[PDB]
Amino acid sequence: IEMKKGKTFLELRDESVPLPFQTYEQMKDYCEKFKGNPRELASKVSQMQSNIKLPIKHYEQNKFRQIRLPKGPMAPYTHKFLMEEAWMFTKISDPERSRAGEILIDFFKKGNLSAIRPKDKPLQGKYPIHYKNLWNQIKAAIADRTMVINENDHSEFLGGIGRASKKIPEISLTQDVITTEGLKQSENKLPEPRSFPRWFNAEWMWAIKDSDLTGWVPMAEYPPADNELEDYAEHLNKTMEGVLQGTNCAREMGKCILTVGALMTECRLFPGKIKVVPIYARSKERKSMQEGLPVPSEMDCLFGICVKSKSHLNKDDGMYTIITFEFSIREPNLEKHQKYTVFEAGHTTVRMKKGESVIGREVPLYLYCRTTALSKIKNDWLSKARRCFITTMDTVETICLRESAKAEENLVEKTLNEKQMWIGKKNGELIAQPLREALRVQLVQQFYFCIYNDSQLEGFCNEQKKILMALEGDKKNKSSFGFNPEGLLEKIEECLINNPMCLFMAQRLNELVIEASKRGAKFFK
Amino acid sequence: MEINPYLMFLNNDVTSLISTTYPYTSTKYTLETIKRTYDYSRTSVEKTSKVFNIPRRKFCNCLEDKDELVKPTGNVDISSLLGLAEMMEKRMGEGFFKHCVMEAETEILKMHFSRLTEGRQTYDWTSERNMPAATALQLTVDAIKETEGPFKGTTMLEYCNKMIEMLDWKEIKFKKVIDSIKHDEFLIRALTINTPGMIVRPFSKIVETVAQKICEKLKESGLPVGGNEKKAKLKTTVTSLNARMNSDQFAVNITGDNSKWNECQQPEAYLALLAYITKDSSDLMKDLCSVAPVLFCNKFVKLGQGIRLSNKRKTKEVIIKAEKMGKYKNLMREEYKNLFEPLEKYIQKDVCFLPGGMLMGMFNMLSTVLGVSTLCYMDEELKAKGCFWTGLQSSDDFVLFAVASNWSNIHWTIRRFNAVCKLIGINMSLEKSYGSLPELFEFTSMFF
Amino acid sequence: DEKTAITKGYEALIKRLGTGDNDIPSLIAKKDYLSLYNLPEVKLMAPLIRPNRKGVYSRVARKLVSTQVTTGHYSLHELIKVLPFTYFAPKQGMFEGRLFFSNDSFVEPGVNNNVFSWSKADSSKIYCHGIAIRVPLVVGDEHMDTSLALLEGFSVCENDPRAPMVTRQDLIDVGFGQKVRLFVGQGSVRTFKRT
């Protein structure tokens, strides 16, 4: 038995070898008989150590520095939808009509959406006419009881502004052809850097509020129990779910889940056809007007209409386009709303308490048009935002597993109701709130992580860990010692471009290490 | 109120809340990667390849351009490598490598070639695309059937010998819409890679099995398993350290992350290592283990989708492949030009003949073995000074524990270790590797 | 504890039956519901009722009990569930299908709940806080008629999807002899007819 040898393989083996050896046999003999001469090796390693200048700093004599953010205009809105700046119509839900087309048709029948008639002059927009004509097309199609759009002129344009052109075969190419057309390589553009977002804070604070309606997100059931551990786990999960579902962030999570599910289904079913989808959600409960205690009411919240242009799983890894027509009752900002074209679609009516009765008061309404691109991977990624809850749950478990072991007793309710956590700075004074209100910030941190997930954020998230670990070591009086921190700061500055989340989080890191310098000795001012 | 969600790290330990910071579970790039692979080798030796008359940049046992050595320098040294291997053997035992290679061999004997169907993905050498392993394997076997009859071996060794025989076949056939190819083209395709195939798959699997059988006996080897066993290993290491040194000595830890761990590992050193290992064993394994290394010494890399042209207004847009970029080099920008001319030599039709490096996520077990060898070093110069080290190493991430009795000799030991690591291509990162007192470190996201 | 207080109150309400005169079944057969609104046990349980909505919950419970008893069609379970609230002056207001207790808990008419649950084929077993309680009597049909214990001035009818969904607020306007579908719980839709 033996591996019968060829020639080309052996020729290669005899060819690809170290320099002083030119045949497998010489190298083999040198290897099988190699002996240890630690003296020459010690001399060689010492020579290597001499011709190397490895610096080692301790972060105390040479501390870090604050990060220099980019300069220029503010980072504008990016997410597909409109958090906080959304006005939602509402209609009582039906289990026999729990579908996108049926819901949209039912909303149209009462005549509210049909009444909407956007005016020609836009407040701040580049391509008004196509958006307004597509809006009329959507109304006319919905009237026809079919979500389809036969004519393909506007969607095609608004999807092709990015790129659309002819293609010349290489075989039909010459030197005269080139010199005539002046063909030159396609210069690759780079994203322009942007400044600090000043509106992320307001969005975050609104996300920490509790909305009137609750139960936007669905969850599974709870199987039986056979001992105390599963009972405690179920109790904690139920508590956290009942606390969280009432938040404004969960509204956006549900909106994404349902809207993207509808888009994905329509793409799979009707490829190569312009369709119409609703930006809807399905509530479960609502805080009573007489008192804040929850009272059940299943409702259906309509925040817009999203066209889906030709999707065919072929170009750009199946990248497809959409177009959004969202509602709002809040006049725009030119700086923030740089991607949205806004209209004034007549008037709507709010409804509020008035003692024993609910009254309505009219207000103006606005129409946020915007053209954007999506893909299959982003759909699969956004359609499952519930993984943030579990991640937040892990944080809870830590606090509820460490303490429970330190004192060897159930301290879950105690820590949840007493344990104070610094949340920010109010009037130059650290605010502190229990863990009950901290969970909202942690959960919105995970959500905003998912919404903006990209290369910049992954790089910054990876590279911030070292700063936080070094600072933690500083807390406990440990001589943290780096090699070239300046390069690491340059790297993290490199990763900060055109993503509000990273610019905001970095500004906070700078203001966290300024505040910590009062108790740490590894950071400049 | 400006919300700042980093303030909870003050009155609470980082380890609990670090998870909150982390989410839940093209031609240009390839050209730059290969250019860096060539530039890191830090040599200038070129030897023509007889079989295809292609220049090969040999980078082994020839250090040059010492200046700016801090930057990654792959070029290996065989003497120190074999010396450290002998040190590790002496430590573990004499018949250690022999026992491990014997175990891996006997385990392979009863193996069926069908195992190759278990793989993440591969690259077909017939359609020139990427697919699961089973599909491309079926393609290859049915092509063998169509050309020179079926393969009735039903075993790994017969499959490998069939591949060998195919290395010498001049014409090979295969279904298509039917076609065939010659000797040189078939070799090329077989040793092609896309950003691997099936020909080298079993030999790589064998080498990985051997390196794994080796890492099991190694205390400082956290690759084969993780979690409970990993914490057990951690605590064993820490207690052994605490019980080793004295009351005057004080230790230190380092969280290191090797940079360019794939663009500085060369299979030639792996071949020399396998030779030294199997030196005393059946010639069968001696020759077998020497297959995948050389197969990786010659690796064609498929350039991605070609560049495009366009006029000023962008109204016209042409698409061309990579093989023809050498025909329009006068048009591409400088950065794209300076990145292409120095490599035109190594291009054949549309691919690049990289004579070394290691891009695949393969031989990770072997890299860990090499790292453990690096850590098992010890001499008398250190003993005289009362200093030493130890630790653990993953594929490209490691944790070091140095020991000494002064706040300065530690720096000398660290520099010694960095030198010994660079001697064999293993470099180190500076913006991602830190260190502190023994209490705090990190490994595979497990913040101790 | 407040829960234990509620449990003992409900136990007293159950025992009051006593299969005898001057008890729930005799007054039922007599169709004298006003006296039910003055018993001692309801007077003992009254303090456990949230003060702000005490008037509205008294109103709703009074109407439900009166309507059920008037027809002779009733169900002991929902009756005993809502009885505690009818010991006060009824005052106009807005009801939202949840008779909140003083402890922030709730009992919604016609839906089973942990605090009080009634399962069909288990009339004897009245589950209060997951604790079974035997009834001192036996019934096989006195409870089967719950068509009037859900809402105040309506009655269940045969299912009909054509009827449009509506909510608590709009119910006041529904015209006579007009079917109205509406949720009776979680994903439970039931038609109703004014009467």
Side-chain angles (χ1 to χ4, degrees):
Chain A
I1 182 60
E2 180 269 1
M3 182 273 314
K4 52 178 164 297
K5 290 164 49 50
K7 40 161 284 300
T8 181
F9 166 87
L10 176 50
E11 187 178 339
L12 296 172
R13 198 183 82 185
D14 199 313
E15 168 176 335
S16 285
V17 293
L19 178 68
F21 311 153
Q22 45 277 27
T23 71
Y24 188 88
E25 302 71 21
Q26 302 164 217
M27 173 280 307
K28 180 170 182 177
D29 300 318
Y30 179 65
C31 294
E32 300 196 356
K33 310 313 152 208
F34 176 88
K35 307 313 305 176
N37 59 353
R39 300 310 314 165
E40 174 42 65
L41 180 49
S43 66
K44 234 183 293 179
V45 299
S46 57
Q47 206 295 325
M48 182 63 73
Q49 181 172 143
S50 66
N51 59 41
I52 293 171
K53 260 50 61 185
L54 183 60
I56 293 178
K57 311 177 192 304
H58 294 272
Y59 298 133
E60 229 292 350
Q61 285 57 267
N62 34 22
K63 302 162 158 52
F64 295 82
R65 50 168 205 81
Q66 60 80 63
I67 297 161
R68 300 184 229 81
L69 298 176
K71 315 196 185 307
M74 186 185 297
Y77 202 92
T78 294
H79 178 50
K80 320 304 125 194
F81 308 135
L82 275 170
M83 317 188 168
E84 199 199 10
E85 297 229 352
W87 178 237
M88 70 198 175
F89 296 92
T90 300
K91 88 182 196 75
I92 293 96
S93 275
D94 197 36
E96 184 42 59
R97 302 271 280 175
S98 61
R99 288 196 282 192
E102 287 158 341
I103 279 155
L104 186 40
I105 284 154
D106 279 310
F107 264 112
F108 181 94
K109 267 170 186 157
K110 56 171 52 47
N112 276 1
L113 310 201
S114 95
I116 292 169
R117 290 193 297 275
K119 323 157 72 71
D120 55 358
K121 181 117 166 228
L123 293 181
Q124 65 180 22
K126 171 58 50 53
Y127 294 128
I129 305 165
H130 276 244
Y131 283 127
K132 177 204 319 169
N133 297 346
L134 175 57
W135 178 250
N136 301 323
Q137 256 174 31
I138 285 153
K139 284 189 301 203
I142 291 173
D144 306 2
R145 299 290 170 284
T146 185
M147 305 295 84
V148 185
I149 298 172
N150 291 128
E151 178 43 60
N152 50 81
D153 52 348
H154 312 98
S155 52
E156 305 295 16
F157 169 93
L158 301 168
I161 60 185
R163 55 95 180 175
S165 53
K166 294 181 176 177
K167 301 186 179 179
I168 316 312
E170 63 187 343
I171 308 92
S172 162
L173 192 69
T174 303
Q175 185 63 16
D176 290 345
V177 177
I178 292 167
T179 302
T180 311
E181 319 315 330
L183 291 182
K184 280 303 158 283
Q185 186 173 355
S186 79
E187 178 59 281
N188 301 134
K189 278 306 312 183
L190 301 178
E192 296 265 353
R194 290 284 169 280
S195 173
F196 157 69
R198 271 169 237 291
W199 43 259
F200 214 80
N201 173 43
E203 285 277 0
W204 203 310
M205 255 308 275
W206 149 86
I208 315 317
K209 295 179 178 147
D210 57 10
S211 178
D212 57 51
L213 284 134
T214 295
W216 308 92
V217 165
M219 304 296 295
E221 55 276 31
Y222 293 73
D226 62 337
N227 53 84
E228 74 294 340
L229 315 89
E230 306 89 28
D231 300 327
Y232 146 89
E234 293 169 50
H235 169 56
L236 191 59
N237 224 32
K238 290 196 186 309
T239 301
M240 201 187 69
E241 281 187 10
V243 168
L244 294 176
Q245 285 287 7
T247 63
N248 286 251
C249 194
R251 191 205 80 183
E252 246 280 6
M253 306 179 53
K255 156 159 46 151
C256 313
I257 294 155
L258 292 299
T259 313
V260 180
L263 286 163
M264 175 158 231
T265 324
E266 296 264 20
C267 180
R268 172 202 89 197
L269 289 166
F270 300 97
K273 217 187 262 159
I274 313 101
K275 285 306 294 194
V276 172
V277 173
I279 310 178
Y280 75 112
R282 284 173 66 74
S283 137
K284 260 151 223 82
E285 324 182 27
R286 204 269 319 293
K287 295 197 238 77
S288 176
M289 295 133 293
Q290 314 316 300
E291 253 171 59
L293 276 282
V295 291
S297 69
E298 267 86 319
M299 286 214 170
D300 182 89
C301 277
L302 179 67
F303 314 74
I305 306 184
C306 162
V307 174
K308 174 225 65 62
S309 279
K310 302 283 159 59
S311 78
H312 31 261
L313 321 174
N314 300 155
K315 303 146 217 181
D316 293 278
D317 185 37
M319 185 231 68
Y320 68 101
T321 293
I322 67 183
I323 308 187
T324 58
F325 292 90
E326 311 186 38
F327 314 116
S328 209
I329 51 137
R330 280 186 77 195
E331 59 181 1
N333 290 336
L334 182 53
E335 50 203 317
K336 172 159 88 166
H337 294 113
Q338 196 184 266
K339 296 179 179 179
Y340 288 90
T341 290
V342 172
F343 283 119
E344 318 84 312
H347 301 63
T348 202
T349 307
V350 169
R351 294 183 181 278
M352 68 194 87
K353 186 170 71 172
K354 193 69 136 58
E356 299 312 318
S357 44
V358 172
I359 70 103
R361 295 178 64 185
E362 282 235 318
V363 299
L365 178 81
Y366 311 92
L367 185 73
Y368 286 47
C369 297
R370 162 174 178 206
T371 291
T372 189
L374 271 195
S375 303
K376 180 176 181 178
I377 309 315
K378 306 188 185 181
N379 301 169
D380 188 327
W381 187 255
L382 291 172
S383 70
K384 282 326 302 162
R386 80 86 142 79
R387 287 191 156 184
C388 317
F389 277 57
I390 287 100
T391 315
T392 282
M393 184 284 314
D394 179 58
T395 325
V396 182
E397 236 183 60
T398 57
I399 286 314
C400 315
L401 198 44
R402 302 268 181 83
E403 308 300 343
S404 75
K406 299 164 189 147
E408 180 44 9
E409 50 175 320
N410 181 281
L411 308 178
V412 183
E413 302 70 19
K414 298 71 151 178
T415 186
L416 294 159
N417 289 336
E418 290 73 324
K419 180 38 179 149
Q420 295 292 85
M421 297 237 302
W422 328 96
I423 292 302
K425 270 202 94 169
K426 191 185 194 170
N427 307 110
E429 303 167 308
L430 258 79
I431 281 299
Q433 317 185 326
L435 211 76
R436 218 154 264 287
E437 216 148 284
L439 295 176
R440 283 111 153 283
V441 183
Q442 320 241 321
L443 181 72
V444 170
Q445 205 192 326
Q446 292 294 318
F447 183 66
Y448 278 174
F449 272 172
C450 294
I451 298 291
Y452 300 118
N453 201 23
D454 206 358
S455 199
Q456 296 86 359
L457 187 145
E458 249 183 27
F460 154 76
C461 292
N462 192 276
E463 307 174 21
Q464 102 188 296
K465 150 175 68 181
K466 296 95 174 183
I467 301 185
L468 273 65
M469 298 293 286
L471 180 157
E472 185 289 342
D474 175 72
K475 283 171 56 175
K476 315 215 295 184
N477 223 27
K478 302 188 164 46
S479 43
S480 176
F481 77 87
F483 303 87
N484 192 10
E486 172 43 48
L488 167 53
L489 278 296
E490 290 293 6
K491 192 155 196 294
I492 291 171
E493 294 149 63
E494 183 277 349
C495 312
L496 269 39
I497 59 182
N498 192 31
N499 186 341
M501 183 41 146
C502 324
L503 313 198
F504 171 88
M505 273 302 227
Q507 182 133 273
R508 293 310 186 266
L509 222 80
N510 289 337
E511 289 155 25
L512 130 77
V513 296
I514 288 294
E515 185 284 320
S517 64
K518 303 180 183 178
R519 328 177 193 175
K522 298 190 188 299
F523 304 85
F524 271 19
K525 311 307 306 307
Chain B
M1 166 160 104
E2 298 233 302
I3 278 155
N4 179 2
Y6 292 123
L7 289 183
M8 53 180 172
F9 289 103
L10 309 182
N11 57 344
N12 300 120
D13 70 90
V14 140
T15 62
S16 26
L17 314 170
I18 196 65
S19 299
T20 326
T21 60
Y22 287 112
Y24 63 80
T25 186
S26 198
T27 47
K28 187 154 211 281
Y29 194 66
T30 309
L31 273 175
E32 267 171 20
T33 294
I34 295 154
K35 158 164 182 95
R36 276 193 263 105
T37 320
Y38 271 90
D39 288 18
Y40 290 162
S41 285
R42 202 69 59 235
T43 197
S44 159
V45 173
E46 180 276 294
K47 320 191 99 191
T48 310
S49 82
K50 299 294 139 294
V51 179
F52 337 100
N53 184 208
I54 304 287
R56 167 202 309 285
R57 184 99 102 78
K58 180 56 47 54
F59 36 81
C60 268
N61 195 277
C62 38
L63 185 67
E64 318 186 90
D65 313 280
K66 272 65 149 166
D67 62 339
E68 290 69 69
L69 177 140
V70 53
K71 266 61 64 157
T73 38
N75 181 279
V76 196
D77 184 349
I78 316 311
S79 64
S80 59
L81 275 181
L82 302 182
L84 299 181
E86 176 178 300
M87 183 54 181
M88 177 138 58
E89 191 180 11
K90 182 204 63 41
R91 275 191 61 187
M92 305 306 301
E94 307 327 302
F96 168 71
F97 289 115
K98 181 182 292 185
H99 183 55
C100 296
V101 63
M102 160 172 54
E103 293 177 271
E105 166 173 48
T106 179
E107 258 293 0
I108 294 284
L109 170 142
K110 51 224 179 179
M111 187 180 297
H112 44 67
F113 79 113
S114 45
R115 194 171 99 150
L116 271 50
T117 60
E118 287 47 50
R120 175 256 173 186
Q121 263 196 147
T122 187
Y123 167 73
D124 183 7
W125 67 271
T126 75
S127 61
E128 304 59 58
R129 308 290 171 218
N130 185 336
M131 298 186 305
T135 59
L137 290 170
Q138 182 35 259
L139 295 185
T140 302
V141 301
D142 62 55
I144 297 160
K145 174 51 156 298
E146 184 216 22
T147 184
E148 297 81 57
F151 172 90
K152 313 71 69 184
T154 304
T155 300
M156 200 70 267
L157 173 142
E158 288 54 28
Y159 192 111
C160 294
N161 262 326
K162 199 69 176 177
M163 298 298 98
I164 293 283
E165 295 167 51
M166 289 213 63
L167 301 184
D168 301 277
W169 293 0
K170 64 172 299 313
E171 202 51 48
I172 301 83
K173 304 179 174 57
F174 52 91
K175 174 59 201 171
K176 183 189 183 69
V177 291
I178 299 87
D179 206 346
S180 67
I181 56 176
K182 293 179 179 179
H183 179 245
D184 62 328
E185 293 178 350
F186 173 69
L187 294 175
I188 277 174
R189 298 294 181 192
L191 276 66
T192 292
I193 301 289
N194 182 14
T195 53
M198 297 58 60
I199 290 94
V200 56
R201 190 59 50 88
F203 307 91
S204 311
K205 290 177 57 49
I206 291 163
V207 176
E208 183 94 8
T209 289
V210 173
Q212 171 156 11
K213 284 286 183 299
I214 297 166
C215 289
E216 183 264 298
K217 285 62 169 181
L218 306 183
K219 309 179 275 68
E220 51 273 25
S221 51
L223 180 56
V225 200
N228 49 279
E229 300 313 3
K230 195 146 70 176
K231 309 280 263 182
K233 299 350 183 186
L234 291 177
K235 298 320 156 280
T236 44
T237 308
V238 175
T239 185
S240 308
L241 158 54
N242 308 133
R244 169 167 163 176
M245 54 177 169
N246 313 319
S247 58
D248 53 17
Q249 290 146 312
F250 72 102
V252 83
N253 65 33
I254 306 94
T255 291
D257 179 311
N258 299 127
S259 159
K260 311 309 193 308
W261 193 259
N262 283 121
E263 312 180 6
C264 305
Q265 296 173 126
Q266 295 82 1
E268 308 177 1
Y270 294 156
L271 176 83
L273 183 137
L274 299 152
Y276 174 89
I277 283 168
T278 322
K279 64 180 184 177
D280 42 356
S281 176
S282 62
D283 269 7
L284 166 53
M285 311 307 300
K286 291 185 167 182
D287 213 356
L288 269 167
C289 76
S290 57
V291 175
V294 56
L295 297 202
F296 297 146
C297 293
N298 300 261
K299 47 183 40 166
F300 306 99
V301 178
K302 180 181 299 315
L303 307 183
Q305 275 302 348
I307 59 171
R308 57 177 65 269
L309 292 168
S310 277
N311 53 340
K312 171 55 175 181
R313 303 293 182 175
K314 308 173 62 55
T315 65
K316 272 185 282 289
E317 166 173 339
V318 179
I319 293 169
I320 76 194
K321 275 58 179 179
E323 52 268 22
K324 315 195 180 300
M325 296 188 304
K327 183 178 179 180
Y328 307 104
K329 59 179 66 175
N330 50 3
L331 318 186
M332 55 173 62
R333 305 183 296 274
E334 301 295 349
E335 70 291 14
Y336 218 105
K337 177 168 182 174
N338 305 327
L339 176 62
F340 183 82
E341 312 301 342
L343 311 190
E344 187 65 12
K345 311 180 296 187
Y346 315 89
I347 309 311
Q348 190 252 349
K349 184 184 68 171
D350 72 67
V351 308
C352 183
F353 169 71
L354 187 66
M358 205 73 168
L359 290 65
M360 55 297 297
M362 213 74 24
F363 284 32
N364 304 172
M365 297 279 192
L366 193 71
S367 311
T368 54
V369 168
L370 170 62
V372 176
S373 181
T374 300
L375 309 192
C376 291
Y377 169 84
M378 180 56 186
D379 54 289
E380 288 50 49
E381 193 182 69
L382 320 172
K383 191 191 308 311
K385 304 171 68 62
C387 306
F388 63 86
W389 63 53
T390 188
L392 171 63
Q393 175 150 24
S394 169
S395 58
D396 65 321
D397 264 346
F398 67 93
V399 56
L400 184 61
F401 291 139
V403 185
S405 60
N406 194 17
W407 195 242
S408 279
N409 56 19
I410 286 292
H411 298 58
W412 185 83
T413 308
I414 290 306
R415 275 138 183 170
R416 185 92 159 182
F417 183 80
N418 181 21
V420 171
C421 283
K422 295 290 284 291
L423 292 205
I424 68 193
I426 293 172
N427 315 316
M428 179 173 341
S429 64
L430 313 187
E431 300 73 352
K432 176 185 35 178
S433 293
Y434 60 87
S436 64
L437 291 172
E439 184 272 0
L440 184 65
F441 67 89
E442 177 273 309
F443 183 67
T444 67
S445 305
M446 301 247 285
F447 297 75
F448 188 93
Chain C
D1 182 89
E2 308 209 40
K3 291 185 132 180
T4 57
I6 296 169
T7 66
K8 51 196 77 186
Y10 273 80
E11 305 338 309
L13 265 292
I14 297 155
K15 66 188 65 136
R16 166 61 68 172
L17 261 71
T19 318
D21 187 288
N22 188 208
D23 313 323
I24 304 301
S26 64
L27 313 193
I28 290 286
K30 190 193 338 183
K31 300 183 171 54
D32 56 329
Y33 50 73
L34 176 52
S35 56
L36 307 171
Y37 308 161
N38 310 96
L39 311 194
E41 305 86 359
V42 302
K43 191 178 188 63
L44 271 293
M45 300 176 69
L48 278 93
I49 310 290
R50 177 141 195 147
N52 177 203
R53 309 278 93 185
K54 168 185 50 46
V56 182
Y57 300 170
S58 192
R59 199 188 58 152
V60 173
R62 211 179 288 299
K63 296 227 297 184
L64 290 141
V65 171
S66 313
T67 318
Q68 279 171 84
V69 181
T70 313
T71 316
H73 302 354
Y74 58 91
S75 279
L76 314 189
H77 306 172
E78 307 298 337
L79 297 169
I80 188 157
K81 185 196 295 180
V82 301
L83 284 178
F85 306 78
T86 64
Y87 163 59
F88 284 115
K91 326 190 173 159
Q92 282 284 129
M94 181 191 305
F95 181 58
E96 310 210 52
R98 267 212 182 140
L99 306 159
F100 296 114
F101 265 120
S102 291
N103 197 85
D104 289 27
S105 327
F106 74 88
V107 187
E108 50 161 350
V111 177
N112 292 13
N113 183 16
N114 78 308
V115 299
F116 184 72
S117 157
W118 74 272
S119 172
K120 197 254 157 155
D122 305 71
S123 306
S124 62
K125 315 309 298 305
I126 281 297
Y127 304 86
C128 46
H129 305 66
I131 305 141
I133 306 295
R134 43 71 169 172
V135 298
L137 286 64
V138 192
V139 285
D141 65 29
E142 291 323 327
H143 64 266
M144 290 196 298
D145 204 347
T146 178
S147 43
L148 296 38
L150 266 50
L151 272 51
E152 42 270 50
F154 293 72
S155 87
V156 65
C157 57
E158 60 100 10
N159 299 121
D160 174 73
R162 305 301 189 79
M165 305 295 295
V166 306
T167 183
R168 195 74 51 118
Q169 253 199 274
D170 212 326
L171 272 155
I172 180 57
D173 300 80
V174 300
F176 252 102
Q178 193 207 318
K179 294 186 170 187
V180 280
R181 274 194 303 160
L182 65 82
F183 298 90
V184 70
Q186 183 58 220
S188 60
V189 168
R190 266 212 172 287
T191 301
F192 299 113
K193 179 142 278 180
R194 171 155 268 167
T195 285

